[PDB]
A paper describes a structure:
We therefore pursued a site-specific 'disulphide enzyme-substrate cross-linking' strategy, which enabled us to obtain four structures of JMJD5(Q275C).Mn.NOG.RPS6(A138C), JMJD5(N308C).Mn.NOG.RCCD1, JMJD5(N308C).Mn. OG.RCCD1 and JMJD5(W414C).Mn.NOG.RCCD1 as cross-linked complexes (Complexes 2–5, respectively). In these structures, clear electron density was observed for the substrate backbones that enabled modelling of residues other than the target arginine (RPS6 aa 137–138 and RCCD1 aa 139–142). Compared to Complex 1, single sidechain conformations for the target arginine residues corresponding to 'productive' (A in Complex 1) and 'non-productive' (B in Complex 1) orientations were observed in Complexes 3/4 and 2/5, respectively. In the substrate complexes, the β3–β4 loop folds to enclose the target arginine region and active site. While all of our 'productive' complexes (1/A, 3 and 4) are consistent with those reported for other JmjC-hydroxylases in terms of the relationship between the active site metal and the oxidised C–H bond, neither the 'productive' nor the 'non-productive' complex structures appear to be consistent with stereoselectively favoured efficient metal-based backbone hydrolysis reactions.
JMJD5 is a JmjC domain-containing protein, present in both the nucleus and the cytoplasm. Building from an extensive peptide-based screen for potential JMJD5 substrates, our results provide evidence that JMJD5 is a JmjC-hydroxylase, catalysing the stereoselective C-3 hydroxylation of arginyl residues in sequences from proteins involved in chromatin stability (RCCD1) and translation (RPS6). Consistent with previous reports, JMJD5 residues 174–416 fold into mixed helical and β-strand topology comprising seven α-helices, 13 β-strands and 3 310 helices. Like most 2OG-oxygenases, the JMJD5 active site contains a metal centre, which is octahedrally coordinated by an HXD..H motif (H321 and D323/βII, H400/βVII), the 2OG oxalyl group and a water molecule, which is likely replaced by a dioxygen during catalysis.
Numbering used by the authors: 182 to 416
């Protein structure tokens, strides 16, 4: 079924119905007036960030054998992986861009809902996810709560509860134990038969929308367009 969408719910309703039980939701009317929503174009990103060095993941999925991580300027990333007919999938993923480029922090806000946590605001981690259509983040789980805010473009997102972990066949290794062995959109059901019947939620996340990913909820994300998302990891 589809992740529910709520317009600016109260703090208490979010706490009781979503945060405490660990249920996903999309929040509307919250980030739709970030200055980023109107300001961030490729040209703006080049002007403010183009000369800075960023880590880039190259390859279809980080679970692939040919996948690698490199460094280049934001201008180079845009030129090679976005505008010119790219040879490979590149993704400026999981990067603390706002600590590197404080000017861009002026264009975003931490959602007020994160104050319902038991952690310090100073310890919230903010990451950029910027890439072309077709980037894929394989199914995995994270150790904090997350607000994933969509700024540019759309993402297809699949969510599996931590109760379903058995049917997701986590990797055995220590580096990949938070990651499923299954390719969500083309699962090998001969090797991973339990996956087929496992229930899930899905959504297309559009600009101005916030997805709440409860701590340890398994998530899979594919960009449908040129995309820019901002995540907030909080407790
Ligand atoms: O946006 C993506 O491709 C993947 N995002 C995340 O895994 C996250 O925000 O924790
Ligand atoms: Mn994640």
């Amino acid at each position: 079924s589809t992740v529910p969408r709520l317009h600016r719910p109260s703090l208490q309703h979010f706490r009781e119905q979503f945060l405490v039980p660990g249920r996903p939701v999309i929040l509307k009317g919250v980030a739709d007036h970030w200055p980023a929503m109107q300001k961030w174009s490729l040209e703006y990103i080049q002007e403010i960030a183009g000369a800075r060095t960023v880590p880039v993941e190259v390859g279809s999925r980080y679970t692939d054998e040919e996948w690698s991580q490199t460094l280049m300027t934001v201008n180079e990333f845009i030129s090679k992986y976005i505008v010119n007919e790219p040879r490979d999938v590149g993704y400026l993923a999981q990067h603390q861009l706002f600590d590197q480029i404080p000017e861009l922090k002026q264009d975003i806000s931490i959602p007020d809902y994160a104050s319902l946590g038991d952690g310090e605001e100073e310890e919230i981690t903010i990451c950029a996810w910027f890439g072309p259509q077709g980037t894929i983040s394989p199914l995995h789980q994270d150790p904090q709560q997350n607000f994933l805010v969509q700024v540019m473009g759309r993402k297809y997102i699949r969510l599996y509860s931590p109760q379903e972990s058995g049917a997701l066949y986590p990797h055995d290794t220590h580096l990949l134990h938070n990651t499923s062995q299954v390719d969500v959109e083309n699962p090998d059901l001969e090797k991973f038969p339990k996956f087929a019947k496992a229930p899930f939620l899905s959504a297309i996340l559009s600009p101005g929308e916030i997805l709440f990913i409860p701590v340890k909820y398994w998530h899979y994300v594919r960009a449908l367009d040129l995309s820019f998302s901002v995540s907030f990891w909080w407790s």
